[PDB]
Amino acid sequence: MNASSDRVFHESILLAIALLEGGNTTIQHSFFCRLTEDKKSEKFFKVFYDRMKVAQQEIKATVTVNTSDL
């Protein structure tokens, strides 16, 4: 929620990936219960949404390769 830089956010994401690990319904309940509080999820979903946005507009300008010849 308060990720200052990219390196902390990436390691926190990898920690959450290692923490969930497929079939732990006991701790998905914890994420759902924590996210149903008053006026705090708006930054969490925004930092998840802009990272979607700033990445999908990267490949539209950078990765434009056309191997038109054999």
């Binding site: 200052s4 830089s5 390196r7 902390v8 390691e11 990898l14 920690l15 290692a18 923490l19 690990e21």
Partner: peptide, 25 residues
């Protein structure tokens, strides 16, 4: 505060604590 390197070190320590297939016996 500044010096986030301690934070990434402790997160890496917790993550490598969580991993399987290493350090078992």
């Amino acid at each position: 505060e500044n010096e986030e390197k301690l934070c990434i070190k402790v997160l890496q320590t917790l993550r490598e604590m969580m991993t399987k297939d290493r350090g078992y016996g």
